[PDB]
Amino acid sequence: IVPTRELENVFLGRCKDYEITRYLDILPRVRSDCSALWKDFFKAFSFKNPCDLDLGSYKDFFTSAQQQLPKNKVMFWSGVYDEAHDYANTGRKYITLEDTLPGYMLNSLVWCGQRANPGFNEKVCPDFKTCPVQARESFWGMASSSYAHSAEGEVTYMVDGSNPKVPAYRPDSFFGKYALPNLTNKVTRVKVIVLHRLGEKIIEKCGAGSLLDLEKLVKAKHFAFDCVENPRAVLFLLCSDNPNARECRLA
Amino acid sequence: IVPTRELENVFLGRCKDYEITRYLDILPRVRSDCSALWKDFFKAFSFKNPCDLDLGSYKDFFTSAQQQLPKNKVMFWSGVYDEAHDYANTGRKYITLEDTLPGYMLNSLVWCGQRANPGFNEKVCPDFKTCPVQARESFWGMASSSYAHSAEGEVTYMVDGSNPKVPAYRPDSFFGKYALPNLTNKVTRVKVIVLHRLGEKIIEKCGAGSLLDLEKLVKAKHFAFDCVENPRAVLFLLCSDNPNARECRLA
């Protein structure tokens, strides 16, 4: 893949914009300034082969960038990027990882280390399908684990219930591996929202298959649990983009 | 009123974020680099009493920041900020002034010049109502005229048709003063979308009152004209935020 251009300028630019003008009424500011955060981010991967990472590498960065999260508004998502963020509505309804300082800054960005100066590769990054798994998932995996550690009250999980190739819940998904396992006793309930795409075959359903496995795990950690499919607020969003779909006929 | 802190850092940060990562396949990049745009903007208002600005103050800045806009996708809005922007969908369905470079950079910010050094106040600014209208509307008024002048094809105008104190169309609104008068012969049609807020009394309707005055003005200028009240896609969007409104009952 293609590395993001001017990585430090974008990082610092997003960091300053965020610091001064974004989510002011939803998330707190972090104590560290933008250049301090950059330094921690950079050392997690710099001057090392691009696959020479593990869950421990960005530990200092995430430690400095962690914000206290709004209670009952944390949302995790799997396979449904646009729908979950459209629904969260830039933090007005829910906060997504991409709404937090570390997520907002690195969202959609691409980068990787190299041993030779300047320590990062500005031309090409591994297809990562080449780095082992613990290296491929070092950044978003520690991001997910730190975010999950700070969640409070009700957490929401939006999943794709229409993918015949990917169960709604998987033990090796980001939520499976680093999210659920790191939720603390500060979490009270996991609320699953299963997306049944408009015009497609339903694959997964609450109370069965992978979603039942998830329910078992969730209750084994003493958390409450509930699950719904295409709730009204979500269906209307889907219909706005495809008003002639059958699931959208009005009375 | 309290001005935005570190205005230059914010302006420059947002400009860099936009440059490298935003609207990449929807709007063209601007030729001037972020540092030059900042110089033009700062010169428009610095070292002048805020009340002495007029429609010509930011003319050069908008000349530098103006982007060619995609055909048939320009939208104007009046009294309906959130709805028009949700529908517009970050440039994917329509373009709004706030998606353009100058709009994105200054959106929501507060600033003011002063005659004393350093030529702008970073602590406090005078409420603008005190100043003459040409001065209060100096920046966004020139912004609109420049945006409007760049419009091609069909332009869309989303208005509040549920306000008994503010006609959907007014000769003194930004659209009335800076938009419609600045639409060139490159515009072929003005398509009005009348927003009827869920649960509110309907006030304006296509073909009557101010929308009839507007229609007459539009036709007198040789543009086609059409008008719709709560088109389905818009209603669904309204329903997502109030799934139980009477207007949203599903078959």
Q: Which residues of B touch A9 (CB under 8 A)?
A: 16, 20
Within 13 Å and on the Cβ side, how many CA atoms surround B183? 27
Across the interface, do B9 and A21 touch by the CB < 8 Å criterion? no
Chain A residues 101-120 with a CB less than 8 Å from chain B: 108-109
Across the interface, do B10 and A4 touch by the CB < 8 Å criterion? no
Across the interface, do B240 and A241 touch by the CB < 8 Å criterion? no
Task: Locate the chain A residue with the closest alpha carbon to B87.
Answer: A240
Q: Where are the beta strands (DSSP E) in B79-221?
A: 153-160, 187-195
The candidate with the shortest Cα–Cα distance to B100, out of B205, B18, B223, is B18
Distance in Å from the first CA to the final CA of chain A: 49
Q: Which of A17, A29, A242 to mutate to test the interface with B (most CBs of B within 10 A)?
A: A17
Q: What is each CA distance from B67 to B5, B32, B70, B102, B174, in whole angstroms? A: 27, 11, 9, 9, 20
Neighbours of A116 (CB within 10 A): 7
Task: Locate the chain A residue with the closest alpha carbon to B89.
Answer: A86
Instruction: Write the DSSP assignment of B9-56 as a string of letters.
Output: HHHHHHHHHHHHHSSTTTSPPPSS-HHHHHHHHHHHHTTS-GGG--TT
| SS3 assignment, position A63 | helix
Q: What is each CA distance from B235 to A247, B57, B80, in whole angstroms? A: 15, 40, 14
Residues B50, B112 contacting (CB under 8 angstroms)? yes
Q: What is each CA distance from B230 to A243, B84, B205, B224, B237, in whole angstroms? A: 13, 12, 11, 20, 10
- Nearest Cα of chain A lies from the Cα of B83 at a distance, in angstroms, of 12
Phi-psi bin for B153: left (phi > 0), alpha (psi -120 to 50), beta? Answer: left
Q: Which residues of A148-164 are buried (b: 16+ CB within 10 A; e: fewer)?
A: bbbbbebbbbbbbbbbe
Task: Locate the chain B residue with the closest alpha carbon to A246.
Answer: B251
Rounded distance between C-alpha atoms, residue B214 and residue B190, angstroms:
10
Neighbours of B213 (CB within 10 A): 16
Q: Which structural domains are found in chain A, ordered by start?
A: 1-67+100-151 (1.20.82.10), 68-99+152-251 (3.40.50.720)
Q: Where are the beta strands (DSSP E) in chain A?
A: 75-78, 153-160, 187-195, 224-229
In the structure, how many helices (H) and strands (E) does chain A have?
10, 4
Rounded distance between C-alpha atoms, residue A97 and residue A158, angstroms:
13
What tokens appear for A190 in the block?
């996991």
Task: Locate the chain A residue with the closest alpha carbon to B233.
Answer: A240
Q: Resolution, in Å, please?
A: 2.0
Rounded distance between C-alpha atoms, residue A106 and residue B8, angstroms:
23
Task: Locate the chain B residue with the closest alpha carbon to A13.
Answer: B13
Q: Which residues of A touch B244 (CB under 8 A)?
A: 232
Secondary element (H or E) of residue B75: strand B75-78
Across the interface, do B249 and A251 touch by the CB < 8 Å criterion? yes
Residues B29, B19 contacting (CB under 8 angstroms)? yes
Q: Could you tell me if A20 lies within 8 Å of chain B, comparing CB atoms? A: yes
Residues A196, A205 contacting (CB under 8 angstroms)? no
Across the interface, do A10 and B4 touch by the CB < 8 Å criterion? no
Residues A213, A173 contacting (CB under 8 angstroms)? no
Residue A111: phi, psi to the nearest 5?
-160, 160
Chain A residues 35-74 with a CB less than 8 Å from chain B: none
Rounded distance between C-alpha atoms, residue A61 and residue A90, angstroms:
24
Residue with tokens 């999210």: A179
DSSP-assigned beta bridge partners for residue B190: B155, B225
Q: Which residues of B touch A10 (CB under 8 A)?
A: 16-17, 20-21
Rounded distance between C-alpha atoms, residue B159 and residue B175, angstroms:
10
Residues A27, A67 contacting (CB under 8 angstroms)? yes
Experimental method: X-ray
Rounded distance between C-alpha atoms, residue B104 and residue B143, angstroms:
12
Q: Which residues of B touch A11 (CB under 8 A)?
A: none
Q: Which residues of A223-245 are buried (b: 16+ CB within 10 A; e: fewer)?
A: bebebebbeebbbbbbbbbebee
Among B17, B236, B251, select the one facing A13 at the smallest CB separation.
B17
